[PDB]
Structure formats: structure tokens, C-alpha cells
Symmetry: C3
Subunit: 131 residues, 3 copies
């Protein structure tokens, strides 16, 4: 149709620790399957947790073929929290589509944390034009 | 008009405890008042808190006539926190409108928590098409 | 173009304490540079922290020429946390453009907190119509 909404959602990912950004499997939009204008991209990870022994947390990024375009993180406020609580995370970025063929979510450990998704997470994009 | 933006906002809700998803009163979009294509729905509860004595928290869901389409939660990282801090929460889901007549926000207790909204919260939807 | 996506992003702001809402520098959309219909506005501050000695936190607002349209906050759950963890924050509001010429992000201290952004934050708007 004429006003594309793109969405990918997952409910889990294998638990991993990574020093560097690695794809969150399943959070991937094939944009080439839009060639001009803009995409407002939301990465929504509403119920993540991190396990670790040095102020755990998770960095998240939005990436295209051109690499990371935006990132951010949550961290706990204790070195070893009593419980690794669920720390809702959302990241919003707008990309110029004019060598972008895909958008994806990525994550990376804070201080060696293991990264946990065990429920709904999504990557969404709304197509628009420049002003 | 030709590119509908839907929005509902509230500033409070009666405090309740619920084992199961119950509507957050006022976060409701009448979609039937769109019949094809997609809605990107955001549930934004930026300043909630939970009270309780067993690692309190709140689950939130986006639901249509067809039930819950996405959910997630925040939880505290202490069994009884010193203070029940404000834990911003956002949830994003894209729905195929092709027996959807309404979208609403819902919530449910984590471990018997009382659920508190006492400031701005919103439910938003942007209409688009399949790709 | 015919379906404008507006975006502004920053990676830092001078650290300040404020009793009242002050602009977050750089999170500003010139809307007048749209005169009818709606804007869905997202303020995304994914990696803020607050420093303070009385349950620190940050309030955030979306404002237009007409003032604040929505706000919310995060707060820590300890009076003086062991570490001031990163507390992702998102705020979503829909505005009727019919004396709006700009949209901006603002912030304000919780209990005298110093306010910290030292990585990506964004303010985004998608143009639509009434239903
Ligand atoms: C409070 C806490 O951290 N509990 C951990 C247990 O996690 C809970 O497990 C039960 C099933 O027995 C439920 O699945 C519950 O949803 C789990 O709690 C959720 O996840 C944890 C990690 C926290 O984020 C909590 O706030 C959230 O509600 C866990 O099964 C055990 C062993 O792995 O550790 C407990 O500390
Ligand atoms: C630190 C704390 O939890 N304070 C609680 C009190 O809540 C504050 O009340 C004052 C008015 O006296 C303000 O309204 C302030 O905004 C309230 O704090 C906010 O809400 C609490 C629940 C926390 O989320 C806090 O971080 C947030 O800023 C509360 O009135 C009393 C009794 O109910 O308990 C205090 O612990
Ligand atoms: C755990 C913690 O709070 N550490 C604080 C230090 O902040 C870390 O500094 C290192 C560089 O040495 C990195 O830049 C790291 O990313 C910083 O941690 C990040 O920011 C702090 C404020 C927390 O939000 C943390 O969770 C987050 O990962 C800081 O440099 C020093 C002195 O200012 O204080 C430490 O407590």
C-alpha cells in the first residue's frame, strides 16, 4: 500500500554476553523489500533484564546497512541488585533512506552482563518524506 | 482527514490490584469510529509506580477486540524498595486492522502490587498500509 | 514532501539543576518551517541519569508555543543510590497544530537533582490529520 508501516516482533532471544553490538535476532526490517524519504524507527524492549556482578545493564542500538544510527542503555543502581528487575527500554531514531536496505535492533553488554529477553519486543518503522 | 492520528490521554486512574489484565480507564481508541491496513500503537505510561511487599511492578498490555497483542512490565530490583520510584514504561505494537474496532491499554499487578498512575499517560495510533 | 517526518537529536547537554521546566538544548522542531491536522510527538531520552541526595530523578516535558502538553519523570528507588543508573525515558503526545509553530523537549529537577544527558536523545514528530 501507499503509507507503509513496518514491524518485526520477537518473544525471546538466546542469552548472550557481548563486548560489541550484536544483532537481536528477529528484530529486522527489510526496507528494500522504500528508497527515498525517511523512516521513524522505534526499538521497543519493554521487559529486558541483565545479570552480572558489576552494575549490570544492556546497551541497545538501531542499525542499518550503514551501522549504528542511535543507541542508549539501562543500568541498575546497585553493583549486585537484590533482584534483576525489568527495565523498560525504548529508542527512537529517524533515518534518511536515500543506501539503507534494512534496519535492525542490536544489543551489547554493560560490564560483562548477560542479556535477557523472554517476552515481547518489537522494531517498528513509519515511512514519511522530508519536509 | 486522509492520514489519521488517534490519541487518548489520562492523568490518573483509580488505584487497583488485579491478578489479570484490566482496562486502564480512558486509554481507549475507537478505531471503527479505519477497516484495512495497519495501526502502529504506542502505550506510554511515563510515570507509574507500584506498591507492594514482594518485588513490586506493573504489567501493561495493548489489547484490541481480539485480546492482548503485546505486553511487558517494569519491576523494582528490591523486595521492598526504600521508595517506589517512577519507572517510565512504553510498549509499541503494530496491528492488522482487517475484526479490530478498538485498541486499549490494560494493566495487571506483579506479585499483588497496587498499580498507580497519577500523571499524564497516553495511547496513540498511526494509520498506515501493508508494504 | 507530502508526509513529513520531523526529527532532532542531541548527544549531550550542559548539566544543570532547575526548579522549573527549561529547554533541553537542541531538542526543537520548527513546525512552521504544517498548519493543520495533528503531530504525534515522541521525546526519547534513553540514557539519562540524575545526581542528588534526596531520591534523585528528572522530569521531562513536551512543549509547544502554548506551553507543556505532556510530562512525566523517572526517579530512583533509594534516597542516595549506590550508583545513578541509566533510566530510559520516553514520552508521547499528540498535538492539534491548528497556534503551534514549534515543539521542544524540556526538563526539570526532581528534588534538586542535577540533570545528565551524555549520549543520544531525540525529539520526533509524525504529521497526520484528525480522523
Ligand atoms: C524477584 C526475582 O527476581 N525472582 C527471580 C525469579 O524470577 C521470577 O520467576 C518466576 C517463576 O518462578 C516468574 O517467572 C517471575 O515472573 C520471575 O520474575 C521476573 O523476572 C525476574 C528476573 C525479575 O526481573 C522479576 O522482577 C520479574 O518479575 C527467577 O526465576 C529466579 C531464578 O532464576 O531468581 C529470582 O531472583
Ligand atoms: C521519595 C518518596 O517516595 N516519597 C513518597 C511521597 O511521595 C512524594 O510526595 C510528595 C508530596 O509530599 C510529592 O508529591 C512527590 O512528587 C512524591 O514523590 C513522587 O512519588 C513517589 C511515590 C516516588 O515515586 C517519588 O520518587 C516521586 O518523586 C509520598 O507522598 C509518601 C506517602 O505516600 O511516601 C513517600 O515515600
Ligand atoms: C557504576 C557507576 O556509576 N560508575 C560511575 C562512573 O561512570 C562510569 O564511568 C565509566 C568510565 O570510567 C564509563 O564511562 C561508564 O559508562 C560510566 O558508567 C555509566 O554512567 C554511570 C553514571 C552509571 O549510570 C552507570 O550505570 C553507567 O554504566 C563515573 O565515571 C564515576 C565518577 O563520575 O562514578 C561512578 O559511580
Amino acid at each position: 500500500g501507499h503509507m507503509p508501516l513496518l514491524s518485526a516482533s520477537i518473544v525471546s532471544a538466546p542469552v548472550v554476553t557481548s563486548e560489541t553490538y550484536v544483532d537481536i535476532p528477529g528484530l529486522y526490517l527489510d526496507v528494500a523489500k522504500i528508497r527515498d524519504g525517511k523512516l521513524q524507527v522505534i526499538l521497543n524492549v519493554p521487559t529486558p533484564y541483565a545479570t552480572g556482578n558489576n552494575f549490570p545493564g544492556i546497551y541497545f542500538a538501531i542499525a542499518t546497512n550503514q551501522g549504528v544510527v542511535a543507541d542508549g542503555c539501562f543500568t541498575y543502581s546497585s553493583k549486585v541488585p537484590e533482584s534483576t528487575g525489568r527495565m523498560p527500554f525504548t529508542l527512537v531514531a529517524t533515518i534518511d533512506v536515500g543506501g539503507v536496505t534494512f534496519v535492525k535492533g542490536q544489543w551489547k553488554s554493560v560490564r560483562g552482563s548477560a542479556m535477557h529477553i523472554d517476552s515481547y519486543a518489537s522494531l517498528s518503522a513509519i515511512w514519511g518524506t522530508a519536509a
